[PDB]
Amino acid sequence: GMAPWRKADKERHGVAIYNFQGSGAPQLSLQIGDVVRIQETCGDWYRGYLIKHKMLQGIFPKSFIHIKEVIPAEIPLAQEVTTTLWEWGSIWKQLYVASKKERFLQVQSMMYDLMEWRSQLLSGTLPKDELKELKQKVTSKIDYGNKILELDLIVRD
Amino acid sequence: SGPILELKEKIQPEILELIKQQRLNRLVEGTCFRKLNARRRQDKFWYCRLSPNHKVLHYGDLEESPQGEVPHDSLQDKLPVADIKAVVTGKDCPHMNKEVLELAFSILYDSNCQLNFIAPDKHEYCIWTDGLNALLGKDMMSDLTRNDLDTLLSMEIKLRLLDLENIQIPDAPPPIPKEPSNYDFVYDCN
Secondary structure, eight states: OOOEEEEOSSSSEEESSOOOOSSSSTTTOOOOOEEEEEEEETTTTTEETTTTTTEEEEEEEGGGGGEEEEOOTTTHHHHHHHHHHHHHHHHHHHHHTTTOHHHHHHHHHHHHHHHHHHHHHHHTTTHHHHHHHHHHHHHHHHHHHHHTTTOOOOOOO | HHHHHHHHHHHHHHOOOOOOOOHHHHHHOOOEESSSSTTTOOOOOEEEETTTSEEEEEEOOOOSSOOOBBOOOSSEEEEEEEEEEEEEGGGTTTTTTTTGGGGGEEEETTTTEEEEEEEHHHHHHHHHHHHHHHHHOOOOOOHHHHHHHHHHHHHHHHTTGGGGGTTTSSSSOOOOOOOOOOOOOOOOOO
């Protein structure tokens, strides 16, 4: 009797805690921090794909994955910051190459602020009133940033 | 860290590529320099710029006034890149205060020809030395490349680790288990 592949129940999403170099398909190599959707498991292995590259699918060790979730408002807000940071990051590099110094710097500071605030949001260390003021500073910077970079204008959630 | 260093090594190349592109774009925009020991009605300022295709450097004198800086070229107007044999800096410079040593660099080409510069500041010094080296297929060594690398690479890493927030990163590689005994998956691909 060999370990059969079965649907992954509560282990739906995870993040790689180390770089996993696979030996090629069916194994999916992972870089630390990669977020994956886990579809099945069999023994000490998961089968799934990279959330940001769903075409890249395969198996990887359970040991290289930390199971997380993907409800308190600060959580989805934290998620919006992550998504926002990736979109700004791409444009930030183009600002760099074209030497648009003012915009480059402005975007650089907004990214550091958002990363820091997101970390504060996820810390669970802020008292109620302060947290509310922090959420507002976050949504305001996301919206302003999206505006000057000419990205899609988000609507409260 | 172990895995983070590994990730930096994988991304570092593309970042160095962006930096090279930034440096060259700057050369193309060109910069204004101030000649050392210019006198008797000689323009004190001049400029140099790299052609948009990256093959020749155009240069000449300038007119530094409250209004602007109109550039008026002379007979000697260019220095093709393909004819560049070397770039020297500091005491290696033929035209070589001390504050100037740090901003001095020269383009040696053809026979015994040489185009000598005195960067307006450390920043421009790095931009040009990095740019010329890139053109010459050499590595960019300025402190600005090191800082730009650290700035862009650190951001990429932080972005990559966002979802590792409040999660423990092992010191050593987790154990790689034996491969599965079968591959009869429940679901399809894509």
